[PDB]
Design a protein around this nucleic acid. Sequence first.
RNA 1: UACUUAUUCCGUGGGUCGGAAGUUUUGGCUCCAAGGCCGGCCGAU
RNA 2: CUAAGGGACGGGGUAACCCCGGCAGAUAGCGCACGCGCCCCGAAAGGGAAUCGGGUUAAGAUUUCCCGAGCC
RNA 3: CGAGGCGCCUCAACGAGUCGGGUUGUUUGGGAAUGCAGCCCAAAUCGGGCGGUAGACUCCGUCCAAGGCUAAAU
RNA 4: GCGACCCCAGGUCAGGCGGGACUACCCGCUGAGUUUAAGCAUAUAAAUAAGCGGAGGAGAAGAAACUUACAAGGAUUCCCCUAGUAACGGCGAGCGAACCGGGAGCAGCCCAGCUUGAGAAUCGGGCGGCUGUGCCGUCCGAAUUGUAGUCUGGAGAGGCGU
Lengths: 116, 203, 116, 148, 50
Amino acid sequence: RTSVTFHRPKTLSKARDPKYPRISTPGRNKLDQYQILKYPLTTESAMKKIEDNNTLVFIVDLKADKKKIKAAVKKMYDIQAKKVNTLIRPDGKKKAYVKLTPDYDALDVANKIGII
Amino acid sequence: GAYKFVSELWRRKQSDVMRFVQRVRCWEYRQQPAIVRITRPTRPDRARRLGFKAKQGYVVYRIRVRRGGRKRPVPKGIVYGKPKHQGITQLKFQRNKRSVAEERAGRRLGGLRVLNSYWVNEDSTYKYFEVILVDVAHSAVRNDPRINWLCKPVHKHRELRGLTSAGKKFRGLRGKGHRHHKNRPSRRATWKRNQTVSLRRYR
Amino acid sequence: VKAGELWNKSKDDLTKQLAELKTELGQLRIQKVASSGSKLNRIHDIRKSIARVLTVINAKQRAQLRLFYKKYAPLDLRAKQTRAIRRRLSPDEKSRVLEKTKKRTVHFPQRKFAIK
Amino acid sequence: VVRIQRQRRILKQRLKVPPALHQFTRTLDKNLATNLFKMLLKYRPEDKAAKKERLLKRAQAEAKKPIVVKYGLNHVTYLIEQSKAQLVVIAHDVDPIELVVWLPALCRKMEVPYCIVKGKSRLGSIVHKKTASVLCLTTVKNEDKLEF
Amino acid sequence: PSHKTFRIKQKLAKKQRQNRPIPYWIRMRTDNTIRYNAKRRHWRRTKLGF
RNA sequence: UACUUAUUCCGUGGGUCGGAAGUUUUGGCUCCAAGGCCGGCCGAU
RNA sequence: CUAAGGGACGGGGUAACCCCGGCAGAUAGCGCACGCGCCCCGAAAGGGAAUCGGGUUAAGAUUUCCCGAGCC
RNA sequence: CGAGGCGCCUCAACGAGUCGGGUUGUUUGGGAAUGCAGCCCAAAUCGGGCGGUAGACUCCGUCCAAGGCUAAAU
RNA sequence: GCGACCCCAGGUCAGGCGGGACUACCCGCUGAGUUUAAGCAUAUAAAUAAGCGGAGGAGAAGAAACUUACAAGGAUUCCCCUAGUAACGGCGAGCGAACCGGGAGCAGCCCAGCUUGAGAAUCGGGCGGCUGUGCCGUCCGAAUUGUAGUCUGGAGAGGCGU
Ligand SMILES: [K+]
Ligand SMILES: [K+]
Ligand SMILES: [K+]
Ligand SMILES: [K+]
Ligand SMILES: [K+]
Ligand SMILES: [Mg+2]
Ligand SMILES: [Mg+2]
Ligand SMILES: [Mg+2]
Ligand SMILES: [Mg+2]
Ligand SMILES: [Mg+2]
Ligand SMILES: [Mg+2]
Ligand SMILES: [Mg+2]
Ligand SMILES: [Mg+2]
Ligand SMILES: [Mg+2]
Ligand SMILES: [Mg+2]
Ligand SMILES: [Mg+2]
Ligand SMILES: [Mg+2]
Ligand SMILES: [Mg+2]
Ligand SMILES: [Mg+2]
Ligand SMILES: [Mg+2]
Ligand SMILES: [Mg+2]
Ligand SMILES: [Mg+2]
Ligand SMILES: [Mg+2]
Ligand SMILES: [Mg+2]
Ligand SMILES: [Mg+2]
Ligand SMILES: [Mg+2]
Ligand SMILES: [Mg+2]
Ligand SMILES: [Mg+2]
Ligand SMILES: [Mg+2]
Ligand SMILES: [Mg+2]
Ligand SMILES: [Mg+2]
Ligand SMILES: [Mg+2]
Ligand SMILES: [Mg+2]
Ligand SMILES: [Mg+2]
Ligand SMILES: [Mg+2]
Ligand SMILES: [Mg+2]
Ligand SMILES: [Mg+2]
Ligand SMILES: [Mg+2]
Ligand SMILES: [Mg+2]
Ligand SMILES: [Mg+2]
């Protein structure tokens, strides 16, 4: 005992291997792409962003962060987002500014969706 | 049968044998926390009569409580009232020390149920009791028809309602007939019965 | 639509129906923000169909799990009662008495009698 | 926990020990103890498997009075007062010491040979338990009459 | 202030939605007694103490 | 009148206590052993 | 991140609500078997990774959008 | 489709810092002290607790505490 | 050094239990004053309000260490009567039960102690099986510092017979 100080010794601890699962339902992704992308904005200010900055405006879930948004637009419309700017509006909803990469034309995407 | 020899010895607390054995134990309890789990009753013969059995589900705890009376806990010894209620120091708690010990144990161990307790030691400032508790979730208790009653919901926290042996002592239920009739079903029940103004419909 | 038909379909077919109705509720939410007059009542019809499909899928899952577990049951599959009912002694435990009591019932039970 | 157990040993050394407790300090000699225990091993009770095997062997026919050590404080105490104990072996370290502190007086009063040996756990091992705390011999085999 | 906690902003959004006139078609229902909102608040009067 | 273990107080990262045997230098650096003898002992009673 | 300070495990008190943090309690871990070992909250004026110029709206950007040029 | 009952005849174990006593406080209709509580003292087994005035002695009547459960009438 | 035990430590170990809420009734603690006394301090208000806890469908109490003084009764609870009585009380203001008797409703039981020693005969868990609130098998553990059974003063053990 070269130390005059006693320390608690290191003891083995096993991991949890339960005899039954506490949850048996698999657990389903309730924040899927349809919850993330609710609907696009069609205001006059929102329509200007389409042809001026290659940008689509969406109303998004409050629980959706920027990473889920760009993954959602890719799985919904097969387009690539260059960047996503988000805000929470004074009405309490979340609004996303989705700028598409060059070689994606938001006006063509806007025509396919139906907002134009 | 050796239990009679043990019981007879514990009646001679002032012998040299019991004084030495109690003095060493009293010192050791002083170096421990006030609520300590023990693997075995110190007085097995006294535990048998109070209901303890050497089975899985019966646990024993040693409880240390302070001795003396109950000083009135008012901010400076200052009472705002008539001189009959101005006393501070020489007042006494209505519950005994044995019930205080098993009530501390019950609050600390909410998953268990107090069976009863017995006296263990004292020096000048502390009294020591061992409290018997039952794990009413264990199958050994749930399958024993002599302790099954403790698993029923009407016996929850009986140490807090004065239903243990110590509680019956301070409730005045350790006697019968006159000198004790005011304590049944309870003193407050007796008082309410004697306050009633019975106004029958044919009077 | 026609939950009776939904109960016939397999799990791959049921999730394929779930995907179609999600795509179609999204196309309506786009229509709702732009313009229409009779596509608006399809929202209620289709939203209820999504609920209908998810109910059938869920009810099949639980029935399957209840069959696969009939050792220890998962906590969500256990019989839910009041908390006090779950803490009760069994009838075997409530009806158990010791030998000295079982003997007196054997030798001296209450009799059937009458007064002349 | 280590400090409390070490101070407990020192306090018992400093405090005047009454004779009825001080007598447990005098233990059987090492040579005698190894003789007695090697003889107590001959009369060990059967283990759980052996008792099961003996039950099966009887069931195959469908015995004899065994000679084994007796143990258990209540049972040993009963034998001594009945004048059937031929030798009593008492452990020196029964933690509630009031369990066995009167035992040498009872054995001496009933004219029964007794000794105090080191180790309740050693006595427990003979009877396939832990901490037997007292052993009794009532009968010995004729092959051991002279040694006993 | 401009510096807002999220929980304060979420409550302010709900109070913004709640002070609207009642829809006109509500007054046309079969057994209707509702006349006005009875819970309109103007910011200059009747502050909401948050 | 003496004792020390109860009790009380003080100190420390509880770091040389009891018995026996056999570094004053200048405002600098100093740890995890060289060495000897058979993982082991002395060096470090 | 810490400040004045606040809460708080164990322990102590208390009929309980609750009141006490230095009273030291195997302090619950850190590097490469081996080695070491003296909790959180609390500042949009304290400490502190890193951005500039020009343009743009009815309402934004006194550095968030656009152009260009950098940095961590 | 063994055990219990009863008739007759030598053992017979029964709960301790508990009872009880003093004192202090509180409570009661309980008055030389109704219950309870703190502290001090501290049991017995031809014994113990009561018989509403404190004490001693002789008889008599009556119970057996200090472990546990228990429907109904309310 | 291998071992047995005792006491203790650490586990997101396997399976489990607890905390809070509700207020009419019920159980435990703690605890005033206004007021009355034509003042006021004991007394009264009141062993009440407030305060802190604990349950249930009821709770609590309960089978005499009870009454009585009789020709004796015979667990608890509640009602009527006892009774504004005995008693208590600056014996002032005031306060204040119980026994008997009559009703409602009735029910008595379980342990510890000596009591297997020709055999811990007891219990829990893991696993497997099944006839599944449980039963059986096997393996581990608890327990002799005592699980089971017998016994509870009304007795009972032992001995002898229906
Ligand atoms: K800052
Ligand atoms: K007895
Ligand atoms: K008194
Ligand atoms: K008498
Ligand atoms: K089994
Ligand atoms: Mg932002
Ligand atoms: Mg204003
Ligand atoms: Mg207001
Ligand atoms: Mg920090
Ligand atoms: Mg600070
Ligand atoms: Mg604390
Ligand atoms: Mg901070
Ligand atoms: Mg700053
Ligand atoms: Mg501006
Ligand atoms: Mg007293
Ligand atoms: Mg007094
Ligand atoms: Mg009081
Ligand atoms: Mg008299
Ligand atoms: Mg008794
Ligand atoms: Mg009793
Ligand atoms: Mg009861
Ligand atoms: Mg009724
Ligand atoms: Mg676990
Ligand atoms: Mg609660
Ligand atoms: Mg007045
Ligand atoms: Mg007046
Ligand atoms: Mg006045
Ligand atoms: Mg109240
Ligand atoms: Mg309920
Ligand atoms: Mg009850
Ligand atoms: Mg009786
Ligand atoms: Mg009566
Ligand atoms: Mg009259
Ligand atoms: Mg009164
Ligand atoms: Mg009455
Ligand atoms: Mg009557
Ligand atoms: Mg154990
Ligand atoms: Mg037995
Ligand atoms: Mg019998
Ligand atoms: Mg007979």
